[PDB]
Symmetry: C2
């Protein structure tokens, strides 16, 4: 059952069609439950040093901010996580027999010296857990090729990738390209992975995000776009993850 | 109605979903009908010089080899072309109220000095029409971006791309990469297009194609694979094109 940090799994479900078991759902579940790295699904992490150092410190902040949401939780009252970008807003949908959780709020913080070390340190560790999961994914990708790879995309790893480039900016070209091109095939990415070795003025001159906001009585809906490495102002939508 | 040589068209069919009007179906129809470049759908072709010189000379060979297939054609007896690779085998499926046509046979020709100029010249012009259509496609791609581009792939331009790299070999890194990665997104390709500027020994040491052949009484089925720029021995399947 145990798999290395960041590693995916290609599932065959005969209708044998590929289904990516990205494992993001797990990462959030463990952090929200505040599990220590010593007793997880997650081996020789020489490629990922300070993984237990940064996993636990992030697990602290994620669980401590979840207990606030859990303070008003019921005994009689799901495990089908969803993720909003760029604030890394964990979306929980509870059943009787819905709340948000922005782990890395990039969009709103005009309080530089006001963000305390009890909040700031935990985020610095949440981006280091995210950065390491993506390094752990690209390592597993490059390491093992497969015939179904050509039928797979970076599409589910977007919120992780956006929050990585986002925090770094408001507080890497490979992370940026990957965040812009969610349509990236697994086989093409493996091929071009080592070839990706190199701040664009215009994109930084206008920032990474556009926030289109509309109203209509009950209506008050925002929509975040991402200024891409190509230029494309791509829409950022909520990504759902299952067991 | 008139469009530049190689240019595609993104169609919106509200269910508005993207549908690529690649225009390959046209190219073959014109060549089989042996139409001259002077009276076609196909502008200032400064980027494609010797286009009428090479279109007509190819149109000659394609029509002259079609008249052989048409010699045994009926008065009472479709326009839904299909393409087999790597021999550039045009597949026609006729109705009463099915034949092949290998325009560029790369797979079988142990007759070097035996291929006459009445055949050889026409093929050299058929690969020059194919090469120019793909140059004409990448020019149109780079020239005009679109929001649906991210939902489009090189997948239908494969037989053209395979025959280009195939003839060149049995008689370009950008054509090769494109032939290997049929899963190439339009937006990613545009982004990396000018970045593609540079013969791998191993791939040439084993050649570009593998030909798996099996038998079973009525059975006698071949299957061509393509040794990719990444290594991948990808299956080459028949591609169908409509009006």
């Amino acid at each position: 059952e145990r798999r290395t940090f960041g590693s995916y799994k290609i599932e065959e479900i005969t209708i044998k069609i590929p289904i990516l078991d990205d494992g993001i759902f797990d990462l959030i579940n463990y952090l929200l439950n505040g599990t220590h790295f010593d007793k997880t699904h997650y081996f020789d992490y020489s490629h990922l040093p300070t993984l237990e150092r940064d996993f636990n410190t992030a697990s602290n902040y994620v669980s401590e901010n979840y207990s606030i949401i859990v303070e008003e939780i019921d005994l009689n009252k799901s495990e089908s996580i969803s993720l909003k970008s760029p604030d890394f807003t964990v979306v929980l949908e509870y059943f009787k027999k819905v709340r948000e959780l922005p782990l890395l709020p990039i969009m709103c913080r005009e309080s530089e010296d006001s963000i305390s070390e009890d909040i700031l340190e935990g985020e610095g560790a949440v981006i280091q857990v995210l950065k390491m999961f993506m390094k752990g994914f690209l390592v597993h990708l490059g390491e093992n090729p497969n015939s179904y790879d050509r039928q797979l995309t970076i599409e589910k790893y977007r919120p992780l990738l956006i929050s990585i480039i986002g925090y770094e900016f408001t507080v890497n070209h490979i992370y940026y390209q990957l965040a812009t091109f969610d349509n990236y095939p697994f086989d093409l990415l493996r091929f071009q992975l080592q070839s990706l070795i190199d701040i664009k003025e215009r994109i930084e001159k206008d920032g990474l995000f556009k926030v289109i906001t509309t109203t209509n009585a009950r209506g008050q809906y925002q929509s975040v776009l991402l200024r891409g490495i190509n230029g494309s102002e791509s829409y950022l939508n909520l990504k759902r993850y299952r067991k």
